[model samples]
Target: SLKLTALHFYKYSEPFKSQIVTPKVTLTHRDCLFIELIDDKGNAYFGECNAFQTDWYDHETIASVKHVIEQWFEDNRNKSFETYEAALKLVDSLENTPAARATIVMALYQMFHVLPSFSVAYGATASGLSNKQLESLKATKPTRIKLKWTPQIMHQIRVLRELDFHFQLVIDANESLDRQDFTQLQLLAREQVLYIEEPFKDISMLDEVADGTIPPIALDEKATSLLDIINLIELYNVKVVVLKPFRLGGIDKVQTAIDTLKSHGAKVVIGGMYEYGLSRYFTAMLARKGDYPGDVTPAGYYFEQDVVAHSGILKEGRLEFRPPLVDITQLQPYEGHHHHHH
Candidate 1:
């Protein structure tokens, strides 16, 4: 059995630049959550949660969720693994809060197992490949490159096209665009963009884009849960789905979405939410199960230190999982409740 230790919270910034404007969000630095579990022999498995709150979550919501999790831990201090899983199931059965469910699911999984984390490589194109590659290599292949869009992205596509580089674009749009944007993107059909993710604020707008000339759309924020996915797939004719394990409430729901998408012949891709090693590892496990590569990239690609001081870095686009080296004494003990926000 392992005894659970401290949790830490901080603040981080998300920086992005577009043609019209560069926007940034101050994250609760909820970017990483660490759990130190030590067994009788002093061997330890460090689990982590890497997720952030959107502007949509209020301070009270954040505090309440944190309080619930800490309370759950205190109440279950001597519970067996099976009992813990049951508690998780009970939490999942709660009404109407997908975000809370997701956090609980992640916390449970991190406490349960030790798995290898995976990282995704950000930019690698056919042009970046060796010159002696075959013609088939020039054709559109599902490489693990994740594309972030900007007003200048279309121009960059032209340059990539000139180099005979084919890729799948991951359009992380905050809101819907006008028909003119679709007209611009339609010209690059041959780029083999796997899917455009969260193209609009409301999924209904996607039907409008499809009515216009835009290609297939993948649902992100729209597909927050299994029920949401089912509704979108059945009602909206959504063709592709992006599965973010954290967003879906945990590994179980994440798998359900993947299975559903596959059964319907709809494409699925595991996406990253700028997580650290532990969260990245959980995502890797999900991605492998989904039989699709994830956009995790490596920890080194984002930060210099392993936030938990455990070795979780990516080399050659894959994560290298090293034994954790955390100082348990440094972590704060779990009181009846603890919460912080930035």
Candidate 2:
């Protein structure tokens, strides 16, 4: 048993130096929940919750709900575990804040279990115990080499090709690209460019880039929610569905989305939101359930020290984790303090 104390939030940023037109989205500080366990001599286990508000939800709405949940927990000290689960249920049920819900669920689960909920997937990859199963399962391997197709990137791609480097291209199409730009991509495709991700804004245009046509399009922002997933499958006959767990809601909803895609025979791959340890752990678990390799960047990719150091690091594009064990402690009442952002 442990007593809950302070919840901290920290913001961070990253840049896109590659030739691809990857726009930078500044992320809200990753949210962290700290609980002091009595059984462990007042030692505290800190859980990182990588929750954020999307453009669709304003700051007010995001803050209000978060404040409400936090206060509710404060009022029910005896209900720490139950309230934590209930709060997650509310977030998932609302379907408005997938990122927030995922963070909250992860934090709550951490308090009860010494090991985080989904560390098994991480361990499997780290120990190399599941390579055969992974390969047999068609899990996509992480390629060390990343190819960029901007006119500038072309020269680099040529160099990689000359060296016989196996690689894949990650394209961000948040900004609309003209047909001529894609024609340049077509030239590269003829040269055997790995699959292109989110090459075009409008998915209907994918038919134009079919195999020899240019780059086979993999939709990201185009499929924001579950309905979008269905539309991409039914209308565009899209073969690939990139699953971002936070974007879809939480683990449970993501599971539902995965089932939906599998039923349609759509190829799916799990993706990340540049999350910290908690979000990364949850996403890895979701990927395991789907039995597919994900596009998760290794933890070292972040360039900064994370709140929970050991739980979410990636070795060669695969996530590694040690089972999380929680220390038990007596419950402590929340001392009244001046609330800041609520």
Candidate 3:
């Protein structure tokens, strides 16, 4: 029999309002659900839920995810693990839950620390950033920048070029195009665009781009899992796929997808949502170690006040991915109840 002890859990919301104009769904705050798990060996692992992307995850709110996690633990608490295989099976059962998956991956990662620690180049999300907004995000010294498409995209490109930022700039339309933008896209290509992300609701419009589709296009919503990623490329000959570990299940599966995509010559960029430190850190691990760059936007960067003691996440402009980020003892505990058992 294995003993699993629940230290405690809590939820906190850190509000933030951008200094510049942003999308309708601009990141307002950082809301996190943290659960701590302690094993018989006295090892503690903290997991942060990534259910904040309810809009992307089909409206599955944080409360609903909490219920799902509670139920999974309830059903498995009393079950006997006859062998290591049984425990592995237990892991698979809860692999789909964000917090649960995070807990497992963190526990494993903490124990081994073998997931390749390296510096991951971070990118800037400029949807809400204009002149100053773009200038402000440059503090992280992003190796690349991503601009959300707007009427002023040409102007934005000109400004970057004039300022001599010279970083690879990508664009995302959030499925906001009326039709294929062959002309504008070609214009962007001439201005040195890396790629465009889901410009139109329908990706098939790329066929219409023909020669006009000068910039490589990436799919976000269409690429959810490894199978979706494989099909996105095989069916449409996609060149880029954005992989978010939390949204695509968790670290194990994320590794698989990255490997699968790379084996097929498709570029893989590990991304993150409004996550707590752990989720973003996990993303940092993949992004830094991966062959490509990833988003450097950390929770603390946007939050009015973040959760970590030392978020040592940023350096001259890239993710240090070093000390000051692994601390978890400061999480305020919920005195109401504890649901840990084996």
Candidate 4:
């Protein structure tokens, strides 16, 4: 039996280099939840909840997840679990709190067993080919360059082709395109691009395309679960997928999704929600199983400074799945007012 002796919830705000622009929102800072769990033997485990401050991405927000975790702790604190699965089973009853459940499950994974390390092929997401971003790209030398779809995207692609950077191109439409944009999207396919991601907000629009006529599509936000991925592949002809552990619930579900996607012969790439280094490290661990390059970068690349000790240094565009040591001093104690009323 394993007994948890201590638990701590800390808050952090990681500053981005610039505004991370999407069609829906412009993000500057990623507010995250860092959870630390300690057992009777004094071994510490860390997990990060990568929920946003709002419901823009999903219904789960930092505040909502915090509330769920508080209630769960009050009920299960000091209880012994025969196995980590037993501990995880207790977490299943907390409905619709995926991010909160993932936080605890991630930490518990480290407590009960040794996780395998993986060499992750990572990519960088650039909104445009700006001078500042171009300068940063010169040093990192990533294998893949991901851009969001914009009105200026065609001009940006033209500029990127003129550059000497050796990289593959991937475009994320962010569910911004409609059925009318298919002709223009086909033009983008002829540009030797890897894939155009989630072109239609209404994914059913993809059902209209004929085989080999449109650019290979990578489904993100739209594919939320294993069933969703299957539906997209069988019905929508999606060839690629971007899986985010936080979005799909947790690492366990992500593993299942990865295996199922592979069996279906779809390319999988682990993605993130502008998370801190701790969560990014965990994502890279799962990225080992993916078939395509993932959305991962150096620890200090996006944030002004990482809250965790690992720098996430990449060697030859690959990150060795290293465990990040939590920097306790950098974490601010959870300041959110606990509203749990018994």
Tens digits of per-residue lDDT, candidate 2, 1-342, equal 444454533332222222212254443333233222222234344333334344432232334445644654455444333444454543444456554555455555555545443332222121112335335223434453333335455654454444332445444444356677766777766666444556666666666655456654556666677787887777764566678765675565677787888787776777765565545656666666553456565554553555345655544434576554322121122234422233
lDDT per residue, candidate 1, 1-342, as tens digits? 443443333222322221123244543333334444343344445544433343442222444445555565565454444445564665655335454455556555655556444344333323222333333234423344444555766665555455454455544454546656766666544466666666666667556544425556677667666777877788775677767765666666776677777887777767666565445556655656554456554445445444444444535434555434444443443333544333
Top lDDT hit: 4
Off by over 4 Å in 3: 1-3, 19-27, 53-56, 75-88, 95-99, 114-118, 128-131, 137-141, 323-342
**Candidate 2: 10-residue stretch with minimal lDDT:** 120-129
Q: What is each predicted model's overall lDDT from 0 to 1?
A: 0.52, 0.50, 0.63, 0.79
Q: Model 4, 1-342: lDDT tens per residue?
A: 878878878888767887677656778888888788888778788889978888887888888988888788778778888887788887887637778988988898887776555677758778777798877667677788888788888888887776666789899888888877878787887888888888888888887776577778888888776777887788777889988887667877787878888888799988876777778778877776778767776666777788865546777766666666778778887764742223
Between prediction 2 and prediction 3, which has the larger TM-score? 3
Is 2 or 4 the stronger prediction by lDDT?
Answer: 4
Each prediction's TM-score versus the true structure: 0.70, 0.65, 0.82, 0.87
Highest-scoring model, TM-score:
4
Which 10 successive residues of model 4 have the least lDDT summed?
333-342
Candidate 3's TM-score reads 0.82
Looking at model 2, residue 72 earns an lDDT score of 43
What TM-score does prediction 2 earn? 0.65
